[model samples]
Target: HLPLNHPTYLIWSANTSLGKTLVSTGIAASFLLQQPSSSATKLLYLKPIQTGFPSDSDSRFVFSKLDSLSLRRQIPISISNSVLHSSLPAAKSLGMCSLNFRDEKTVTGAPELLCKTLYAWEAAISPHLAAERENATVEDSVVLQMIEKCLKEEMDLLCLVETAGGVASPGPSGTLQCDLYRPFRLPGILVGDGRLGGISGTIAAYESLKLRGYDIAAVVFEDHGLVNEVPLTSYLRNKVPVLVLPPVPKDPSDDLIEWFVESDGVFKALKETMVLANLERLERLNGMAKLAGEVFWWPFTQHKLVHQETVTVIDSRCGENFSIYKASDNSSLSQQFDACASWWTQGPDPTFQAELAREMGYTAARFGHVMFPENVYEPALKCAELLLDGVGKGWASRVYFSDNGSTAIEIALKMAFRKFCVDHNFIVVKVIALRGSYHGDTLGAMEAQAPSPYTGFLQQPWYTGRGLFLDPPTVFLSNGSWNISLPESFSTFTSRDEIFDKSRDASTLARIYSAYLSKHLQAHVGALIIEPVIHGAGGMHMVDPLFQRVLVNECRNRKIPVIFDEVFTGFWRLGVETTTELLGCKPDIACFAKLLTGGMVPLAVTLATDAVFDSFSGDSKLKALLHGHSYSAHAMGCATAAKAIQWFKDPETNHNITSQGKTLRELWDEELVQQISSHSAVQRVVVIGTLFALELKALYAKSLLIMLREDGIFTRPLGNVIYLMCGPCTSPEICRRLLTKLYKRLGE
Candidate 1:
């Protein structure tokens, strides 16, 4: 009688140190111990292939153990004692087995002897007379047929053990190719030494078994007790229901066996692990089913009824449906009527109107009616107040307001150039700008922008000075060689400490101005324009604040007014109200926009120091700064800007910004950089503030855009640089998802 179930056709082959012998015997013992008592389960352990002169002792030991356990008087054994001394078949026939028997001189002609010994063992383990077995010439035919009949009769579970050796070769007797066993599909467990060199053969055997559709429960390597270390009971219980017996103790002492039999720890651990595994599996299945039902099917079923009965009420008193109102109907009174309707509709809305009113506080009523109340006006007034106070404090001379950042740059450029013309009496004036830099898009602003066909068409009339293109420090190239050159003019005069003893004389201020003024004289330059600190549109490029100071002092010394175009870098993008404030170098005029109205509307301003503004105060109209947009300093725009400035000054907003910004950079470092690095095609991952750029190798440069789009992450490539330029409102999850998709496609 067996304990639970008996396996059929167990084949044992010769090997040393953790091979088929242990696995075959252990599996036989497990089945015999676990099979039901009522079932007449016959267990036969056969070692079909044995080698070496000492193999008989090993086989005898295994056979004797089984006989003792089964209480049998006599157990059959088949192997000629002279087989080890006889000549074997072709030596080359044994392939990977060469590793074990390296000395062909001593182990020569052992292959045939090995084959004969295996055949003898097979005959002894099988029944004396096969019952109606047709395939007499088939290797292991009787055993395979017997196992099949027992399985068909539903004898619990059946197990099969095969030799762990070289891959089953193509031969009449090869275990893998034998006709009797070729059709069998049985789950398998592999046992092998967990040494480094042994994995190759084991893996090959595993792959072959898998190709034949064998359900492998687990592959137990005998070294390190990996099966016991990891939670293998849970892993295997649901798959092939296998148990990986621990490796044989090196000493084989009585203490080990006594401990193994008496100890309840492994059993208790296994039971707990199995229970948890089943619960987790069930929970996962339920979750998947629920998701499929709710997300995939519910929209067309009961959920649709709930949505159909839902009704939204709109208050007509507040102009709920007033987006339809327009100026064409009442041309003369259009502005007034539109303003009133806007107040009724937009002025009461929770998002735009409420936010503006709250940000502006109680003084929001000054801009026309309370509806469409100008929230940004108050902050602009405050800034204007600060500017007027600056004038009194010798910090500012004039303040000019515009409708947007580009207009602000235009106004600043006009003021700077006009100041130079008045101070130097130059009719045709010129200005120098850094290359790879973008100021804005207005005609004058476009002239300040780096020349690209995208904005090159606007370079007309020739009134704007010729652009002086200066190479940026960070260089990118499609061919992988990016030589970044710091401007030679700036680098040469960087230090004057040794030449001049006094602190003021040690500064590079005098040289930079003199050199620039000389360059200005050569080019008939009137003014110099720069986007100090961070330059956003030109790929989030950044420079030292000290560089701006040097440039500013230089321009002042040259009698040329400096213009700081802060359209993109202004308004807390660099953690301050203005880059000028952060740099401690005031330009003759500073331009601002973008976040001026909290990015809600088009508004910009140009602030000038008293000295530059006074130059335009002459009695002659021709000398005055002759530039104005029709909607310049519009009340509504000013109101929006004022609200935005106040919002920036709020303690909560500032705290939130600092926290979020730090968090964004940390997340990029931890998650995104490593992910992008895994791709062989990505050369670099660059991050500045919330912006991220991936420089790609030439192999992936062309297809990166397509890949990103296909992966559902929208990204635009600036040449070979693919970047994410997101604002503070962008979520961390959004960045993760976007980077995940980018990495996936890059790998593809």
Candidate 2:
């Protein structure tokens, strides 16, 4: 929430006693001296967490040092400062704190420099330890809000936020300072250590900050006669500029006026380095869209129809919101709820993202890349075991790894065809599929779907859609009622559980579906393929489980292998681990990819039953699966997938996974969903776990998306359909906000 008008940087250090405050003060003095005295310019220095307060304060030190330095240099900048002892005091002092926190403490006079300490403690210890001793409660959110408010104050000010201790120092909330300040992702300036054994500490500090996605502008330190900058500079390869200041006078009470004068040139160079880096970042963010238009060809996007101004330049994502960089609006960054879940591939929250990164890094370091076929690694072996027991469970016994969903589908098709051809002792050609079902964009998988724009002759010059595609009976809510949209040739189930009832398989609707599927089974179909529970790419259509169950039965009777493309519906997207839990049937060959690694990397698995696995075991090399990617069974992907699979089902990890992890606790508010379903502008509605969608009656879905973006909700439309997708760990509160925003937009 910081203002984009000024170039702000966060000052960090290799370790404590590196003279971070002195360096910060020097930079402030240098910036002030560079400007004309007649100009009304402002500079801000913020120390968010100050321990050892009343005894030692970084902000107060900077403020008084700037005064003495200015008096000697005849500087024109003025100083105004404030210190809030704790969260309660901060709230009380700022008058409950608005978005800007504009209270009497903020400068209103001719003060050209503003120095503030948000939270301070008298115990000269770590912020977390100090908070424990003083019995003062300070949360990370409150601290972040205070910092954000100062940065966003309506002014033309250059800003700097200096951290305490080292880069990985613990904050008041016991979280690492590097992580606590990650929400801002501010540019950094590391105050490197110049004493003995400082090189390793400085490099480690820089790497730690870099690991959290910080951009280090410069490394500065007071000269300690060790000449450490040469080795550090050589190691950095000049990517980040390094500056060295003159040694401080031995006497602490001399005011260090001479030291300030000697260090003036170095500090000026540091400020210039930071300013240039900030401006370069701004220019790159603003020019990315135009550059994309000229050089990049996005998938599924028509270049002629897309406007450059409409391209969203995403800066970063934290939890469920994408920090969008708006070049047209003062080059500001704003949060927008990722309603589409980044093309439905996202699942983890911010904490999970960090955990996955660490896990992947460990796996990479442990086993860089090992051969897969006839060889075994712990990650891949453990991942296979988990998949067979979790998503595969009773029906599957073997796993085949691939690159993505499309390749997984291709592998599954080969397995299904081989199994069917082996069992029936005849060559089978075509497949039985749903009309609107889309498996993938690969040519082999594309042929399994009914002809669409993606599979047209223009896109795939030789697409025949070589399958017997049947029109599926969809389920939707209209006027607050759950009704089954029957095929032109097909239920008003009051509850979802009742709709999935086992007794309904004997009803008249089941008999009709039996007859309907039997007619299609007579075409010598080799396999029955489907995206169980819901068809995602074909517009989030909820397919009737009864019809699909009947189709699977018919295919079984005809000795046809079944394939379930659970690429989108698998891994808790529909409130269940696997779609079989919702549909009450399993496929002979099933494919999973999108959430397999919790959206960490591209990895897919085509799980097969023993019947399918045995067909390829004839003691010959050619009789094997004969399909694999170089990165198949990769260590990092498998390790992360194992972590994600366990994380999703563990009650401690995903609080919504109640009832002994059998299902989700229904994150979406039922009353709000019903209201949206009954809204006038909504043509139909579908609410499932982590997914809430509505089909608009009008074709201006693009206009509606624009308005939603303006309201801080990012969404993408599928023809006339608009949907809001959330991660499995996304809070119910965030889901409610998304629904309420969508509902209000529809009302407008």
Candidate 3:
């Protein structure tokens, strides 16, 4: 909640005992004195976390330094000291005691110096250990709230937030202080270590902060005869300004009054660098949307239909919310819930993202990308084991690692076609699939689906609908009642239980489905591929599972390999580990991606049964699946995937998971779903697992999306269908808010 107009800097240190507080004090003094004696300019020197509270208070040190500076210069300034929180009771008492005393030269209309501490402890250890000893727990969010409250006071202020220990020091929760404060992403000022071996320490700390998306405005250090600034400046490529302060006295008890006078010019230059960095960042954010429109060629997007106003200039993402830049509002950065889950790829919250980042870094450092065909690594092996045990249990026997959903689907088709050709002695064949189904964007994957605007001749010159596409029934809720709408030749069913009854195998609909499959199978069908339960990119259509089950049975009887394109519906996206559980059937081959790594990176797997794996086991090398990407089974992707696979199923990590570990604990409220289903403007509704969709009868979908954006909900529409997708771990209350906003927008 820091004011956008203020120049705020997060003071970070390279190592301990480098006098970071001294530098912060000098910067604060320079900013306060830069204004006239009668001016009402304000400056805040904030220490968010402090240890050894009474004896070693950074805020108290700054307050005393400013008092000393005022006394020496005979210039009066208004000063306020506050300690918002403390871990130990004694530390709390002392913090409050320091707030009452004031200097005698204070006067009206003078420059103001605000020294605040958000949290403090008595022990001189890391915040985590100190808090543990005091039996007090301080969450990162609580720390951020207090710091935000201090910076948001009504005034034009220059705030400097000084951190404890060093750059990678642990916070109260044991997370690195750099990562703990990343959500705000405030610009930083690094206090470099100036002693021997300090060059490497300073560079390491700078890189750690930079890798986490932090902007360092300037690097400041004391003069230690080593001239560390030369190497640091070269390492930074001369982009960040580097300045050196006068050395401290040999005696620890001496004051730095003379040093402060000599270091005035350096502090002034540091302040100018900070102001320029803030201005540049704001200017870049302001022009990003226009620049993106001129340069970016977005997929599935028509350039003619896009405009500058339609572009969302995202400043950053924290958890499930995007910090969207809004030039029209004073808040500057607005938080919009990621209702689309970033195209159904994101699953973990911000806290989990940090955990995943650490694991990914470790894996990358250990094993970058080994040759997957012959060599073996721990991450890939662990990831494969998790996949086989979790989603591929009881069916899949082998895993072929690839890059994305499209490539995974392509690999699955190659496996299925090869197995069919080997067993049935067929050289040419077609895939049997449902109409309006989508697998992916790759040419081979596109050929497996029926033709549409996505596969038009203009889109792909050699495109043709080569699959035997059948018309399957669909299910939805209308007027708060479950209904199954069959194809034109069949009648609709109003009962949900009747449509899902396994005993319906003896019913007329089952016989009709079998007959339809038999007729389609006569066209030399080699494979049956489908996006079981729900078609994500095909406008969120909920296919009748009974038809899919019968189709799988028919393919098994005819020895035609079946493939389930679970790229969008796998990894708990549909509330189940795999669609095999939802459909009560397993595929001979399956493609999984999208949520595979919990949306952290691109990684896909095409799983096949042992029988299919044997088809390519001939002595010749060409008999094996001869397809792979350079980054296949990348260590980073595999490590993240291994973590995500277990995290989503663990009840402790994902409270939405069921106790039985089969499905999610219903995220969307049933009453809200039914109410939206019964809306006058809604044509039909589909609510299953983490998906809530509605087909609007009267649509201004572009305007509706903007309306939702204004209300802090981000979503994307599919033609007349607009759906809100949440991760299996998303809170039920958030799903309700999304539905509530959509329901109200439909009324307008």
Query: Which of 1 and 2 is the better model by TM-score?
Result: 2
**Stretches of candidate 3 exceeding 4 Å from the true structure:** 1-3, 15-17, 35-40, 71-76, 85-88, 91-109, 121-138, 168-176, 196-204, 224-239, 492-508, 619-622, 740-748
lDDT ranking, high to low: 2, 3, 1
How far residue 208's Cα lies from its native spot in candidate 1, in Å, is 70
Worst 10 residues of 3 by lDDT: 95-104
User: What does the lDDT read for residue 187 in candidate 1?
Assistant: 31
lDDT of 2: 0.84
How does residue 356 of candidate 3 score in lDDT? Answer: 82
Evaluated at residue 717, the lDDT of candidate 2 is 89
Per-residue error for 494 in candidate 3, Å, reads 10
What is the per-residue lDDT of model 1 for residues 1-748, given as tens digits with 9 covering 90 to 100?
A: 1111233332412124455554444444434443234233333333333333233333444443444433331222221111121112212223101112311111221111011122212111221111112122334554444334434444333334354243343222343432234334333455534544544545555555543434454454444444341333343444533333454466855423332333223323332333344344335433543355445544113554433112111111111111111112221001011111121111122123335533443333455422212234544567576534432124555678777777888888788877887788764566776666777665787777666655654445543435665543332221222222346555522321121123433466445544654464445567778877555556545443444565567667778888888766555544455655545666777777675665445667788877788878888989777777766666666666666565554445433244433222222434455567445676655444345566676646657765654343334456666775443333445556666666677767
The lDDT of model 3 is 0.83
Candidate 3, residue 213: the lDDT equals 73
Cα lDDT tens digits for candidate 2, 281-317: 8889879999999999899888999888988898887
What does candidate 3 score on TM? 0.91
Q: What is the lDDT of residue 173 in candidate 2?
A: 78
